[PDB]
Homo-oligomer: A and B are copies of this chain.
Amino acid sequence: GMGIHQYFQSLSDLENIYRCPGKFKYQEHSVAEHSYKVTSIAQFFGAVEEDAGNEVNWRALYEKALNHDYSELFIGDIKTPVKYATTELREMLSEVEESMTKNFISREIPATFQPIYRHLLKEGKDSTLEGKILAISDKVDLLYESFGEIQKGNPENIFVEIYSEALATIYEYREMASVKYFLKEILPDMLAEKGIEKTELPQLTTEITT
């Protein structure tokens, strides 16, 4: 029943939920693993922002990143770009997820800790600096996931589309010292990988960033 023990057991269950199941991937990633990676990416961008002179709320940076996909435990989320799911339909999914999280907290978390879990499990992406770090870090992981598959020779075009959408989103955050660094130093290393010159990525990247 209700207790932190149940919550601790649940952490392991996130190892058994995988990202965008269906299409073949040479390497699958659990939601737990994606969360570890997003928090590590966010941790890096936090350092970049502080180097640039920006005050970072570290508790907010880390909590947003670490907990952003915990709700995948009870409701799936669509990582591929808009094909069959509209905007109206994606908001319906968000409301269901919101309600289920509420019900989870009420059922499983002791009253003393419900307020902190309500805070930790709510929507983390907003226009705060830490919110925006979450927005870009989530897309950087999705970029790396899709790029990895392309680099390994995966033949499905969906991965090029995911890469394109992820990069286009990152580019909307180009005011950030984090994204400036990403575009200047990180992305060129990606595109310089052997064989990438033979793919669509260089051309897509130019189209999206100019």
Contact = CB atoms under 8 A, between A and B. Distances in A.
Most B CB contacts (10 A, CB to CB) among A36, A113, A120, A148 go to: A36
Given A8-B186, A103-B83, A155 B36 contact: no
A148 B10 CA distance: 11
Contact of A37 (B12, B17, B51, B195): B12
Given A13-B24, A33-B33, A85-B99, 11 more contacts: A5-B186, A8-B140, A12-B27, A15-B30, A16-B23, A16-B27, A18-B21, A21-B21, A36-B66, A62-B66, A89-B99
13 contacts: A4-B185, A6-B189, A11-B144, A14-B22, A15-B27, A15-B30, A21-B22, A24-B27, A33-B33, A39-B39, A43-B62, A83-B103, A84-B104
